Design an enzyme around this catalytic site. Sequence first.
Site, mmCIF file in Angstrom:
data_model
loop_
_atom_site.group_PDB
_atom_site.id
_atom_site.type_symbol
_atom_site.label_atom_id
_atom_site.label_comp_id
_atom_site.label_asym_id
_atom_site.label_seq_id
_atom_site.Cartn_x
_atom_site.Cartn_y
_atom_site.Cartn_z
ATOM 1 N N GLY A 30 56.995 64.825 44.883
ATOM 2 C CA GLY A 30 55.281 65.264 44.827
ATOM 3 C C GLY A 30 54.401 65.595 43.308
ATOM 4 C CB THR A 31 52.051 67.192 42.185
ATOM 5 O OG1 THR A 31 51.130 66.843 41.974
ATOM 6 C CG2 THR A 31 51.844 68.236 40.724
ATOM 7 C CB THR A 32 55.130 66.547 36.689
ATOM 8 O OG1 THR A 32 55.730 67.248 36.183
ATOM 9 C CG2 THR A 32 53.719 65.947 36.222
#
Lengths: 244, 198, 250, 111, 242, 241, 233, 243, 244
Positions: A30-32
């Site tokens: 997933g996104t940071t």
Amino acid sequence: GTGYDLSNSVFSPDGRNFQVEYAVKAVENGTTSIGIKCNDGVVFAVEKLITSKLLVPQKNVKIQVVDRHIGCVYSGLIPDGRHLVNRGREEAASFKKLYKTPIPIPAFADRLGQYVQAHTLYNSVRPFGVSTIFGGVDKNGAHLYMLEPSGSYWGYKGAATGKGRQSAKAELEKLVDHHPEGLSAREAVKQAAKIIYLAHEDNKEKDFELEISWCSLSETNGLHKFVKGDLLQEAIDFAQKEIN
Amino acid sequence: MDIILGIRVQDSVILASSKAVTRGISVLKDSDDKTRQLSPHTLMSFAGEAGDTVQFAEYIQANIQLYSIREDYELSPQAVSSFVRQELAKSIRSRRPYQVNVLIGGYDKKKNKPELYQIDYLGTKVELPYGAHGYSGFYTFSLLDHHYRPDMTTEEGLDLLKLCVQELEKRMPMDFKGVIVKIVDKDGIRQVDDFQAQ
Amino acid sequence: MTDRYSFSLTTFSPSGKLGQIDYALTAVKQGVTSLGIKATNGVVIATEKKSSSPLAMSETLSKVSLLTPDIGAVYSGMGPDYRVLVDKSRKVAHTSYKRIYGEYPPTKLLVSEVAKIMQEATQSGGVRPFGVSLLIAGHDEFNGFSLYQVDPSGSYFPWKATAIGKGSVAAKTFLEKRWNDELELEDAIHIALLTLKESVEGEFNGDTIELAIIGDENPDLLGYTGIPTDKGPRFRKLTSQEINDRLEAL
Amino acid sequence: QFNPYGDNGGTILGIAGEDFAVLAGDTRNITDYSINSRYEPKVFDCGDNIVMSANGFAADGDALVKRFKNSVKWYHFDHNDKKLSINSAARNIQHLLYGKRFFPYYVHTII
Amino acid sequence: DRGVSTFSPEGRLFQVEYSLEAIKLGSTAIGIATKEGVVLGVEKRATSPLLESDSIEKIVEIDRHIGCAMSGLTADARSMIEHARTAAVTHNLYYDEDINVESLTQSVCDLALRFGEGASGEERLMSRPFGVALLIAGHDADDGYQLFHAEPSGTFYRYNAKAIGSGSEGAQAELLNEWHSSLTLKEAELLVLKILKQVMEEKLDENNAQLSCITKQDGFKIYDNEKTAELIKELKEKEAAE
Amino acid sequence: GYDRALSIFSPDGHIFQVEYALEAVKRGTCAVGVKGKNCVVLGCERRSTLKLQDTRITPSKVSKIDSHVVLSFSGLNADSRILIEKARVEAQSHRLTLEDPVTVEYLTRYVAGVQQRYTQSGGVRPFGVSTLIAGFDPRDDEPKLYQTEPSGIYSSWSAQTIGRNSKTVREFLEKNYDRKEPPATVEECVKLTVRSLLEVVQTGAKNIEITVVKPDSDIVALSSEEINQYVTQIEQEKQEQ
Amino acid sequence: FRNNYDGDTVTFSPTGRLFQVEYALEAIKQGSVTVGLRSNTHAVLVALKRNADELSSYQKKIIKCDEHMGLSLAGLAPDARVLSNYLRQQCNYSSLVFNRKLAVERAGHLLCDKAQKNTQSYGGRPYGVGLLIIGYDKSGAHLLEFQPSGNVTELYGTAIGARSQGAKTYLERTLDTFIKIDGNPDELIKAGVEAISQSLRDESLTVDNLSIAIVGKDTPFTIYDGEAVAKYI
Amino acid sequence: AGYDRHITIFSPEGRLYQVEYAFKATNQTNINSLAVRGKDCTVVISQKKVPDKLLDPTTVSYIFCISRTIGMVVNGPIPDARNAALRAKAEAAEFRYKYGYDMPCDVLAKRMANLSQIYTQRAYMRPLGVILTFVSVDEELGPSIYKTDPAGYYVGYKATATGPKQQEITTNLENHFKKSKIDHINEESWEKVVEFAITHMIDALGTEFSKNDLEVGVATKDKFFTLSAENIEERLVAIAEQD
Amino acid sequence: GSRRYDSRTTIFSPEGRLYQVEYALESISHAGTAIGIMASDGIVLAAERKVTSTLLEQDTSTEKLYKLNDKIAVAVAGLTADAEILINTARIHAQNYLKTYNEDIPVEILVRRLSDIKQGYTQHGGLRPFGVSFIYAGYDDRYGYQLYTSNPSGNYTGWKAISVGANTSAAQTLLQMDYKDDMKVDDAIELALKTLSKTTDSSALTYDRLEFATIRKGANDGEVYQKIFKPQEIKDILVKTGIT
């Protein structure tokens, strides 16, 4: 034998829950997203991968508010994150209904902690594919927490999860060492913008949008508020200056 | 209340039930059959609450007929009356009780003897040579205490019921429009269609 | 959430064997040896207190438990499975008997109630059978003294003398030689200490051995005086000193 | 003891023509001897060319009209935007009213 | 094992796709919708000569203005017909009018996906999907004469003409060429009767084949054996002409 | 609690649990039903794996649902009792509410409805029972004969058989029963029933039971001697040629 | 690998994927194409309806939720019915209790949370339909794309279904043109017709094939079919 | 057949593998902890390991305050530890409300062990991969140590140890009590009992400690309390002026 | 989920058989042999105790012969614990009939109801069937002396002489060889002992391995009496019959 990784509540020969460890893989994909604890509050920042020009800017909000003082941000399966915030909102309202005072952050952290841990006890339920960074200001100072799919949570000076968590943690560790006296709410917003931009190199193929929120005692009266307008642009410019 | 009479003689049980159905001010029916056949050798007459009276009787009838087909066997008049008593005993402590008083007259094929049972809505069962419900018993019991003999034939018992009806027609304020008379013995259940002027 | 295991975990194999019962009996075989001997005027039940650590206090762990003031129980197999059965047996003695008849159940009926609980753990959905065999000794007015053995299957048999656990085969053979229908309570205790020595590897004293008896009424253990009909419990656990005194006359 | 009912007065009037229909009603809302409002609409347009007014207890009147207006809305959702006829509306209101047979809407409704 | 509501790698439900295979084994059912009315026709398919062919009920009445034909596991249809008949009567009670054919079909299809061992949504208490497809035909004042094809998938399509069952693939291809928007009621009657004769394993007569129609005037009517036999004779003479 | 979907579809569009339930019917003893002009006859064969039974108390194959309706079956004996009980309760329930005894078609429709329900409900297996339901409609002299199966499908027959070797006896009836002239007499209707059974039973005087249902609640089961007289007469028909 | 972890939605893969969710997404790509696009005043849904045969009808793709909201479907029709009926109830709840028209953003939140519950619990299956929700509220015109995974995204223009990439690439290029079509419903519809024609391959969009819906500043959500869409072909 | 190691059912040997693997999960944290009894106090020492610099050290804890009197130290993963901690606190409050007195240490241990037994028998509940050590000065029994495990087993201790290097600490304590001939640490003040526990911890593990390496919990009459970093620092100065 | 571990106790085999029912009958075929014989003046129940020791108390022991009613008694073959659950419910059903009708329950009705409970575990529930076979010996005023048998399938039949448990094929052949319709109870007692002695897997048939019960209508009373034989009473009859 094998097959220990098929069912949720099953212990493997080495005392591990593989379905939980498989849920962490969904988070790492997933996104940071990051969280920085300052001298009187906390600052949350998230990467927003722009898939195409068709996405309406400043609309698809990822950071969520619990009650009026807690802010939540997560990495991994977005719908799973929303489910956890929904439960947290019910859990915060249940506390305030009986005890009058808004739910403390260490109290709220346990409430989510027990709920996520409950999803590792049965084979009929799936573990959460999200790591949630959350916190706010209560009776005695500010708090920052990061929750795992296992249900494990700790207090953090600086938290990071997602795609570029390693690049973020390295930048967060630089701040803890260089600032033993404590960073300010104004400085934390600017620095959070920089860390997201530097952590974006693990996903530099796609263009992204920056989203920042903060909860400070002196700046926002201890209430969770989104960073908008001039202060947002000031942070973006601070990041764009130090990226080169 | 309606008139429900019962008398057990030598070899049969005779049941007499009033024909009138009155609702408030008007007599709607004057030929009502206030009795149901539970089995070939067991008959049950009934009186009480307007709606509950027929609903309970048909409910009992359905259960006895269900048992008769399941086992291919007829229950004894004692066993049927014990079933009816328990149903009323459960009813009295329920939300809305059945307000039905019953007389069960049957011929036991095993013992070769007639039997009469009297059960009220509370679940009070008693075996009697003669029985009546409501206000009918206030006139008839003293008559039957005087004239009744156990060795009396079916014809003698019909004459004794005739003497009871004449008293009820003379002393009672309600016009019950006469009675329907049925005989229960070893041959089964038959109706006396000539009691209007016997 | 919700128990989705509504089906049986114990089923009949092609050979006719009920696997989970057989394996539960295998777990009993691994357990520490416990024994029971019925005499003319009492019944004795004994076991070894297998200390997991010398730092652990063996007193705080009772393998022999009081069910009613006239009935006691001892086990072989799984400790935790026994402990919950004791709590269930104590409660079922009140709820299913004492709260109805005003008196404690006879040995045969309390054993039957324990048997029912263990039987259900064999058939009910989403459970495994109890990994324990129980030796229940008791006394009632109309049956006298009796000893019973309850298995994971739920089957129970009355015994004159028997042993279960590790060396149950060797202990039963020794019990057959020494038992007679004229034994006194003290004689049964003497044989119990003889039979248990053969199973014990390490120390054999009043601290490593747990022993209790179903004998005469104890008015000193009643706690109150005034009621003539109440004469005290027949179940009595022997102290560490009471065992050591009889070990000198071994 | 709490009395769930009340009376808000007023009067409504409905006359049908050969090719038209009227539904009139005063705009006065009252309680006992006091006036609550001099202008409070009582006759409502419910869509599909149907007018409705429930007169008596204002809270039950508003709840019934609100439930009918919503019943017309769902009639379009379930039956491909079919227009609800006046005879169909009347039968639907019967079921709305008889639904609370043992705790009645204290109103005299006219469509 | 595997769940009853499990998705395939292709994006389909296993139990639904397997249910369609069961309908492919069932008897042939053909429906044709015209401006004069909708005609329904089924194959009886008697397993033995001792079987009374008139007891086979594969065309049923839902309401006076709505009828349907079944194909596949005919026993599974009984609860669907019951629901359809109830929904049509309940709508008549609530609204003092006839239920739309589209609205009736939608109500029947609302039961199709109500299967599972505990699917999160409501309370779907049914171990498996229905093993029967329906040809709901009727008439209402808004859309006129209609023909719908109800599937165990929960989806329904409206057709000008549709054939379901064993010879469904060959019969549908025949319907493609034969149908036009100006067919009369009688033309559709011989057309169903002709296409049934092609796909049926047995020789078509009035005992192993049944016709029915829905019109605005008379409503849903099942053709008796005497009326059907005259149409078969007429169909034989018209085919022998050229 | 237990709602595991046992009866489910397979790749080839079959429900195996329903399919194997018919295999249990093929195992059970043969039951045959024929209808004449004014009577229906039900005949069932008796098993001979163990012979020392008390024939007085041993549950008979033909069971009465009501005074005018009867039910015979093939397959599992334990499953049939549940179907018979539910039918007997429904028979009384119809008499209670409708004030009229069931028609043979309606009682068949109920039994078939119960069997179908067990094919798509969670946690249950289908009945391993096929039934033959015979009788007469209230105030009607027209003979009725119906058949149900595990799948829930029901239909009326002029002559039908179910159970073991039901394939053989059906062939007999297909070439011995004429729809133009149904057995106009009770005697010749029973004869055709015994003839069809003798193709399977293989000399069984005590292995054949015959029950005759006539209009207006007239049901009677024939004794061993009565049936034996038919077998003796039928065996002569073969020997006189 | 995949065969061991695709049994149910409750199971994660070693890589951290949900295959049952991914298979539910494959049901959309099998479904017919539909295009959504908006300006600052209006929002348009252009849906290509699919027929089984030439004798069959082109199944409806657009469902009305409220006077200010509606959605188009791609995939399983009954799964679209369940979600649309739920959104019909939520729009109705906001109007009855709060006298408030439900915001299009919040409508996407509600569809996200309902679809998520089917992806975490055993027994249940993911919804097999993608949805395109349009609406005009207090913040102007809106367009949202719903995915069975639970992911809902607000967009200017988009398309879902078979060959939907052709339409999506067009709208990504025409972005600066159709966003400025304000006060003109006809030109915004024509831009959507030009978008849906980019996804065409089998046939050309006809009269009983085309389905167009519109909602805006002074336009209640209305669906046009057949004769009403003839001037756009 | 091979699913006997997946759910809590008996294996052919009469074993429960899921319980055995739950025991193996207890050493996942790599933390050692000991418990000793004083003359009128009970002390628990546990290893405190903070690997990440980004962590707030004050939040990292495995010692829980169950009631006013009872404390609990856990060996195993923190999510399962907090699950057992919340339950123990809920059970302690309920007991006081229902029975009118504070729940004893051994009763809480028995109750928690009985709950652990249920997961051992029932299939849908997995065993908690944690070992719980309850400590308090009971108003009847005095200084008390009671330890529960995933098997549902519990027993009292004169002194105990738990962790990966459990055996080394256990034998070290054994040899002291074999020498002293008493079952407790003969000392008046708790400070010296804490000092004893730290000393024998160092001797067994062979590792020196700083003020942030340890975690101390002290149970006295009517109160249980945890020592701060400065409270441990004062304790480490006292043992340094002896060695 | 939990589906993985489901044995599916209530399913048909490809042949049309019930796995668990078949395997439960296999379980009973190893249990002690129980025999019931009906005579013209009574019924005889005889059962062989499986696995006995010198230290096994026999006086208080009851494993195979149970008393349901004052007129009905049973012989048990299979699991002792599973039988007692069914026996308890049979005793309750007998009392429920007596409370409702004021008459003792006819033998067949009690047998059918108990068999219907066994049938329930065969069709639904997902639980294992009871591994128990019963021999019902009883008397009522309708059929007189009756002998029934029931198995895990839920099927029941009537008998003149029947055996359940181990070596039923050997026991049934010996019974079919020596049984006559005009037998006396004393003759039936002898037949039961002769049949058991020849089907015994052990060395010799002794009293401590036997349970005996007779249901006779005493001529000097006019009522039915049940007589469960005592250890000494079994020892006596063993000598009189010529086995010693």
